[PDB]
Structure formats: structure tokens, C-alpha cells
Design a protein around this ligand. Structure first.
Ligand SMILES: [Cl-]
Ligand SMILES: [Cl-]
Ligand SMILES: [Cl-]
Ligand SMILES: [Mg+2]
Ligand code: NA
Ligand code: NA
Ligand code: NA
Lengths: 274, 100, 10, 273, 10, 99, 273, 10, 98
């Protein structure tokens, strides 16, 4: 019932002192809908989902202006942090931002996020109250003091509770056929012998949306966690996701084991046997 | 500073059927920094037309990318993904297994 | 729609 | 200036069956659904349908999947009815749709089914009664009469079918209400010192309906003539040729005649030399 | 637009 | 119960050596629908071949168009190779520029 | 902040129907084409922002471009006989026409000019009331178009429909048509001998194609031993160009490359490093 | 939008 | 009159061995418009080549862009081969990434 919008900004400095590479992506739940790439000749926020193409030129103008504005600040901060930490001129460094908002079923604001990382480590983060920051050590402490004095949190909070939520509700309406859908997983089980004494049972879940899913094993109806493997949920490349779980079993005892699939698109949880 | 080596999965979009067109996927995730080299291989040679998703990252800041190309699996042709990253001493090869 | 208030970190 | 909409459903059992649906307006395919192409969704196959909203594609996907599920069951039931081996493959096909005249009004409707390539049941022209094959189709006819299926099928054919056909004809007017005339020429192919083959070509035409005939001295020629099936060029147009075997030196007694909707007047071709 | 009234044959 | 396929092999546009074109193999009039169709170049199977969506005629028989981009020349031979349950061994129909 | 629309028509006879190709540009962006060889026989979109036009637009553009090509086809045959040109040779009629608007969207200038076999044939003068014609057959055309008041009709198009639709295109395609991608620049060095070397100044990825690359030596314009290549399309809607100068060895840093482009706040100045 | 008044040259 | 084609061969983006790019052959300044243009990979004709719609400049000379996606390597040699009525033999222009 709840839904989320998230933006992911990446600024990567290039060797020497060249202009950093900046990429932004926007997601609603597990569906990407926009991108910006400083290496593209367009230099514009671009649509990446069909239900966003209906936004007019004032939208794309404003999206493009505001992401470049962030990228130009991140580019300067990369230079400053490089000098702050004495990081050699031959070396690449990264500023990342994740931010966005969650809405409930009624479309009301639930929670908001705005957090930054430098070189893969937490740098500064807006706390859940949207009024205070958690900052790392050293340079980020200067940032936290600077942002407190500038009342940045008030401005970030206004975005997260206001425009962020307003526009997520609009995307959820305009892309409702895509975003409010649930595709249940298509499930099957395979059998892979490994010796005369043992065999691997693999439980498959394919073509599901959203990505959240739970696969578990049981033996004789008791939870089975030993000798089990679980792959990271992975994208099929068509808007749906894949996952499998496996267990190594003694030859002849395959029928003691069951696989259990929990997913929002299933009327009730599934059980599979070999 | 905090660098992370990539996880790699090689797989197909749809269950493989010899003779039917499909997509070969190489999903790289859990890595940092974001610069990475990913090639899809057919019988040891680089496939020339490969597309990839837009760079994104997870809550833990690590990056992920899906590299994909059209292919037709056969009983004899061998497919793989070749990944190199600053955290990898040498390129890592993960062979496509239709059972995974 | 992306944020518009841009904060310099340093 | 009449037009037709047709849907063609195919279900093929596999030792879950493969299901494919295609939709046509006249000779132009505009939608498709495939069971093996995952993200199972009715997909556009013509640019003028792409303008339909995601709600349209949802309902089409839903309603086409609903028929495939019923066809899937019926395939199993018919397999048991006819004691057909479990390692064999069998087929259920449906063709249906409607015709409208130039005023856009209903002309006629169709709904007919086949099992294993033979007529199974068909809606009669009155749209009130069924013509059914023997054995299992007689049970279907009994069931469909009791369920008043003909009234429900007639409502679709005279209602939604015609209504949406008129909508497609307007949105896709540029391509659907067009007539690309055939580009014609004749070739000469000696087969001996006494005989030769004249071949009359028609290329690049739409719609597919065309008539090629041969005459000799202005009289109809049927003996020693060959005609190939009208074939798609792959670009949305069609091709055809007709041939006749003529005694050497008599080529110019023969004429090829080309009738097509795109031609203001029928064409007459004669070997040039 | 496809039909919506589905008739089971048996 | 079963119907063996008719086959036509032909180019999309009139052929001229050196000019990019499309090679078509039109299979029709067959039942059941499962069929194997390959476009051959000098006897060898051309890899990237596409086909139309399965449809059928008024008599219920199926038809499919198989096609791929090609550039004809004077020496190169092209053909369509078709196999079907009605065919004991595959049928080869050579592409003739005049048909 | 001026903009232009241009159409380019080419008819090329064949040793039988001539090949006719038309293309439309707004500034440096192509947005339509017609090709007599294409199967559609229709004006086709070549830019994203023109696809939103309805069926009446493409009907009208198809009819008007084809009407011109049919007259060009006849005129090719007439000029062939006028000039006694052999029936196996190939000949060309080209038309360029279009209009320029200022920042206020109003008409600035218009063009309509024709060439036969790559040489000026007849052209509308800047006043849009008189013609400039070549010798021989074009003098007949000039007399005929004066008596027919062709210039009045051509002027009406250039000041009316041409300007009106250019404005519409600039608005519908504002995101790409009104953009200015500045050039990315760098300098390369290419030794020639112990006495001389080439300095090359690159400009990449810019739009519109209009750009000025010049060289100075100690702040004085440098015209000798300089070369400009024709601006070339990168294929993604941007353009590329470079300027070169031959300099004495050791004096590379006395020379500066200067880059002017609509997408640059101030002109750039590059010097070898 | 292309021109519509077509002038024969000869 | 007859005008011989000018030929430039170049990549869309700065060449990097092993990264996908586009190979361009831009022919301009020619007349009449009929022209033969092939992109070569190690002397063999590339099959995928597309080209822009025929247009012309103010002086009536024609221009065309022929292009194909390619991946530059260190060993592979790319070239543009152009024939025209003004040329006694096809002119080969090799791709130089500089
Ligand atoms: Cl980071
Ligand atoms: Cl000319
Ligand atoms: Cl006049
Ligand atoms: Mg490495
Ligand atoms: Na067979
Ligand atoms: Na004469
Ligand atoms: Na030549």
C-alpha cells in the first residue's frame, strides 16, 4: 500500500583534474523513470518510463536545471574534500546523494530521506525528524555546522514533505497501471545431482514485481537453514525480478524438503516440492 | 577509501531454450567505486553490441549495473561475463549456467 | 521531481 | 469502402500450451499476444495503436488471457474425450471479428473455432444459431445454446467490435484507409527454342486483394497459366505474379490485366519487343 | 478490442 | 489431419547485386503450426533471422514470414530450408531472382 | 536569436521514373523526408517533435511535395529535349527554399532558387518580386513565371505559411531546436620538421553548426599558413570542426586559437601548453 | 510545411 | 558540370580501444548525387552501414553521412571507400583516430 520515490546522484572525479562524471537516476518503488548523465550530448534530464513522457517542457527544463545545480556544487565539494584529505591528484573520488520520500495508501507523507556519502562512506544524513543531521568525523562535522547555520534542514524538510510527496502521488496516478501492479512470481523447482550421496534442490521465482520476496526451505515442516543458499534478487531486464533458493539434500530424501514463496502478488504463500 | 569488490551473476531473462532468442544478462552489484569494465563473451570473444542500465546504487552506497545483449543459446556455444574493477587483481570470469 | 535547494558541503 | 477487424487465437498443447493472438484491421496486423514472450501483455504491432493508454493494454491483456485459460482447459478435456496420446500436440484456433460498410455500420460478424485444424463450431450468419461438427462439438453446441452464448457473442460483434473498428480506422486513417497501387512489369524467360514464359509482376500494393489475368487476342487464357499466392513483402505491402507459357514469336498476342483498388482504371501489360 | 465473454466448450 | 507447407522464397525489393535488400521465406498452408525455417547462404544457416507473428487463413492453415537483411551478389546462392512433421527430410527451396 | 527553415528537393533522372528526395530542416536539424523509392510514398517524420502532427498534416505535405516532384519530372524531360541531351545520361533539378525569422518570430528573409545540372537556373531576388535567371531555357522560365505572377505566390508562401509553421516547429521542438550545445575544445601538436609544426584547434560536440575558429599570433590576426576543415556532423545532432596553423618551431605559445559559438558566454582562447 | 503553388518551368 | 567528392572519416566520440563508438564517413561537395560509399573493416565491406537523407549545400553540391556502430581496437584498420563519376578509381581513406 505504501510507495516510495528515490533519487540517486553519483559524482565521480576523473584522473588529472578533468570534469567529474555525474549521473542521476530517479525511481518510484523498483521502477526507474528518469536519468541524467553529464557525458550525454543532450545534457538534459531524460525520461526512462512511458508514464513520465507526458510531462511538458517546463518540467524537463526545471528537472534539468536543478540536477545540474546539484552536480556543480558536488563538483566543487569534490575539489575541496580532495584538498582537505590530501588525496593525490592521480586518484578518483566519489560524492553520492540518496534522497526521497514515502507515502502511505492515502497518499500522505510517511517518511523522508536525504543522505550523502564521500568515497563510499557515510558523510552526512538527515535524521528521521527532518530537523537534525547525523554527520561523520572530520570534514562532515564542518558541513553539519555549516548546514545548521544555514537552516538547510528546514529547506530539505519542505521538499521532502511537500514537492517530493506531491509529485510521487502524481507519478503513482499517471503510471498506476505500471506502479500499482503486482506480478506474482512464476515458480518451479529443479534437481541437480552432485554425487551418488547428495543432490541440490533449486527453487525458482521468476517475473515478479515488486522485488521484495521471501524464499525459505523446510524439512519435515521444520525450518531448514543449514546447507541452504540464496542468491541476491536480480533484474530480468524487463521490469520484473528473479531469485532462487537452493538446498543440498541426501539422495533419496528429496521429498522431505519444501520451498515456500512469499510475495505481495500471491493470493497466498506457495509451497513447492520436487 | 572504502572500496568493495563486485558481486556477479550471469543469467538469461527467460528460461533458456536452444534455438529461441533470449537475452544474456550480467548483473554486477555491491561494488565501489563505480568505474567498472564488463564484457559479455561468446566462446571467449567479446560480444560487440552490449547495453547496460543507468548507474544506480543501494542503501549501503554500493553500485549496481545490469549489462545485457540479445543472444540465442545453443547446446554448444559457451557464454560468460568478464568483469574488471580496481578491487580485482585480474579480470574475473563467470560462465553462464542455464541452471543458475 | 528533484530537489532545488542546493547546499554546499564546505 | 468496407473494412474488417479480425482476431486470430491459436493454442498449441505441448507434451502449459503455447498461446498466440494477433489482431488485424483489414490486412494490417496491429496487436499481438504471445505466451512464450514473457511479461505476458498485449503488445502494439502498428504505430497508430501505440497511442492507446495503459488501461487499454491492461484490459486487452486481461481479456485475451481469460480466453487462453479456457482454451487451455478445453485442450485437456478434448484430449481425454478423444483418447489422444499424452505425448502428442493438439490445437484450438478461434477466428472472430466484424465488417463495417462505408457508413461505419455493422455489415456482418464472425465467431468460429477449430480443433486440430478442422471446423469445431461456428456462429451462423444470423448470429443466433451455431453450426457444429460431430461428437464433442455437439456437446459444445448444446452447452452454448443453454448458456445463451450466441446472444453474448452477437452483442460483442454488433457492439464493441464495430465501435472499436471505427476508432481504429480514424486513428490509423493514414495507413488503414490508404491504397498503394501495384507497380507492374513483365519479364521473359525462354524455356526452349519453341516456347517461352511471360511473367507479369505486381509489387508494393495494399490492400492484398488483387486480380491478375492473362488474355490472348483479347480472349481469356487459362491453359498453361501459373499463379502464385499473394505474398507479403515484409514492409506492409504485398506481391503477386502470374505466368503463361507462349509459343516463341507470339509474345505480343498475350496481355496481362491487373485489377486493384488503388488503380483508377485496370492496367493492361504487353511484352515490349 | 478483443471479446470478453468466455465460453467453455466442455 | 495434417497439411504440408507451401514455400515461396523471394526478395522484398527487386534484386540488384551490391544493394542491401531483404530475403523472405513465406511458409503457408500448413498444419500443425510447429515448423522449422532457416535461411541459407551458400548452404549455411544464416543466424539472425526474424519471423512474423503466427496467424492463419480462413481454411485454418497457418502462415509465417521469415526474413533477414541481405545484400545479393552474382555468385552467392540463397535458399530457404523448411522442416515440418509432414516432411520426412527438410525441403530446400533455392532463391530465384526471377520468381 | 534567429532561426531558419529550409527545404531541399532533388530530382535525378534515370537512363525510368526519376529519383526524387526531399528533406526539411529547421536550422541544422532535419525533421522530414520524402523518397520516391520508399514504399510508403508519403512524407515521413525524421524528428521526434514533428510526429505529433495529425493525419491532415501528413496528407497535405505528401500531396504538395509530390505535386512539385511531378512538375520537376516533366521539366527534366522538357529540358532534356531543349538541350538535345542523350537519353542515357542523368540530369538533376534541385530546389532550395525557405524563410528566416528573427527573435520576435517575424519574417526576415525568404529564398526560392532552382538549379539544373548543378548550375543556377532561376532564383527569386531578395525583394521577393523579381527573378534572376540563367541563359537559354531559364529565360523562357523567367518570362513564363513573370506572366503567371509566380513571384507573388512564392512570396505569399515565404512570408506566410513558411513563417507560421517555422514558429510552430520552434515551439513544439523547443527542447532540442532552441538548445545551444557549446563546443568542447582542445589543441593538438603535429611536428613537420625541425623548422615547422602544425597546431590544430579542435571543437567537438557543438550545436548549432555555426562556429568561428580563428588564429592570432601575439594578438594579431593570423591568415597565412592556416586551414579550416568543413564542419562535419558527429551523427548525434552535434557537429565537429578544427582549425590548423603552421608555426615555427619553439614559437608555439605565441599563437592563440579563438572559438566563438552561440553556446559560449564569452569567446574561448586556447594556447599550446 | 512545404510550398503548395507549383510552377512549371517550361 | 562535375564536382569531385570531399571525404572525411572520423569517429563520433574520441576513440578508446574496446569501447563502443560510431564510425563516420562524411562525403560532401560532389555532383551529380549518385555515389558509392562503403565502410571497410580490414579491407572488407561492413554490412550494417546506414546513411543520411540526400541534401545539398548553397552551391548545390551534395553531402551525405555514412555511419555504423563500431568498437575501435589496436589491430583493426577502418576505412572509407568512395567511388564517383569524377573518380577514375575508388578512393580509399583510412580512419586515423587523430
Ligand atoms: Cl561516495
Ligand atoms: Cl541541379
Ligand atoms: Cl513572377
Ligand atoms: Mg582490476
Ligand atoms: Na519433419
Ligand atoms: Na531536342
Ligand atoms: Na567512378
Amino acid at each position: 500500500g505504501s510507495h516510495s520515490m528515490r533519487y540517486f546522484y553519483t559524482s565521480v572525479s576523473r584522473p588529472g583534474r578533468g570534469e567529474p562524471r555525474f549521473i542521476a537516476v530517479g525511481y518510484v518503488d523498483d521502477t526507474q523513470f528518469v536519468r541524467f548523465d553529464s557525458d550525454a550530448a543532450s545534457q538534459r534530464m531524460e525520461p526512462r518510463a512511458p508514464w513520465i513522457e507526458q510531462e511538458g517542457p517546463e518540467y524537463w527544463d526545471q528537472e534539468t536545471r536543478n540536477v545540474k545545480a546539484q552536480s556543480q556544487t558536488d563538483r566543487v565539494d569534490l575539489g575541496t574534500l580532495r584538498g582537505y584529505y590530501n588525496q593525490s591528484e592521480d586518484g578518483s573520488h566519489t560524492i553520492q546523494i540518496m534522497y526521497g520520500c514515502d507515502v502511505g495508501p492515502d497518499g500522505r507523507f510517511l517518511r523522508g530521506y536525504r543522505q550523502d556519502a564521500y568515497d563510499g562512506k557515510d558523510y552526512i544524513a538527515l535524521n528521521e525528524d527532518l530537523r537534525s543531521w547525523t554527520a561523520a568525523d572530520m570534514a562532515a562535522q564542518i558541513t553539519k555546522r555549516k548546514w545548521e547555520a544555514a537552516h538547510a534542514a528546514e529547506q530539505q524538510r519542505a521538499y521532502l514533505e511537500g514537492r517530493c510527496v506531491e509529485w510521487l502521488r502524481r507519478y503513482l496516478e499517471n503510471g498506476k497501471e505500471t506502479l500499482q501492479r503486482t506480478d506474482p512470481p512464476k515458480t518451479h523447482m529443479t534437481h541437480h545431482p552432485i554425487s551418488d550421496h547428495e543432490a541440490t534442490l533449486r527453487c525458482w521465482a521468476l517475473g515478479f514485481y515488486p522485488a521484495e520476496i521471501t524464499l525459505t526451505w523446510q524439512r519435515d515442516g521444520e525450518d531448514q537453514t543449514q546447507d541452504t543458499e540464496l542468491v541476491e534478487t536480480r533484474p530480468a531486464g524487463d521490469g520484473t525480478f528473479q531469485k532462487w533458493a537452493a538446498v543440498v539434500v541426501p539422495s533419496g530424501e528429496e521429498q522431505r524438503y519444501t520451498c515456500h514463496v512469499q510475495h505481495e502478488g500471491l493470493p497466498k504463500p506457495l509451497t513447492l516440492r520436487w | 577509501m572504502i572500496q568493495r569488490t563486485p558481486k556477479i551473476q550471469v543469467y538469461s531473462r527467460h528460461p533458456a531454450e536452444n534455438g529461441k532468442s533470449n537475452f544474456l544478462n550480467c548483473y554486477v552489484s555491491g561494488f565501489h567505486p563505480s568505474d567498472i569494465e564488463v564484457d559479455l563473451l561468446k566462446n571467449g570473444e567479446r560480444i560487440e553490441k552490449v547495453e547496460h542500465s543507468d548507474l544506480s546504487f543501494s542503501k549501503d552506497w554500493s553500485f549496481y549495473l545490469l549489462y545485457y545483449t540479445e543472444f540465442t543459446p545453443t547446446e554448444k556455444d559457451e557464454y560468460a561475463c568478464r568483469v574488471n574493477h580496481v578491487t580485482l587483481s585480474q579480470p574475473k570470469i563467470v560462465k553462464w549456467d542455464r541452471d543458475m | 521531481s528533484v530537489l532545488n535547494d542546493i547546499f554546499s558541503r564546505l
